[PDB]
Design a protein around this nucleic acid. Structure first.
Ligand code: NA
Ligand code: NA
Lengths: 10, 10
DNA sequence: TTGGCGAA
DNA sequence: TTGGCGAA
């Protein structure tokens, strides 16, 4: 996720 | 780092 | 080398 | 499979 917590996605 | 941005370190 | 974050 | 986050 994120960042943070990529995306999702990407 | 962090998380985010572990530690460092660990 | 290790940390393992945080879903679609 | 991809994203590549962010130093000691
Ligand atoms: Na290294
Ligand atoms: Na998977």
């Amino acid at each position: 996720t994120x960042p943070g917590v990529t995306x999702p996605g990407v």
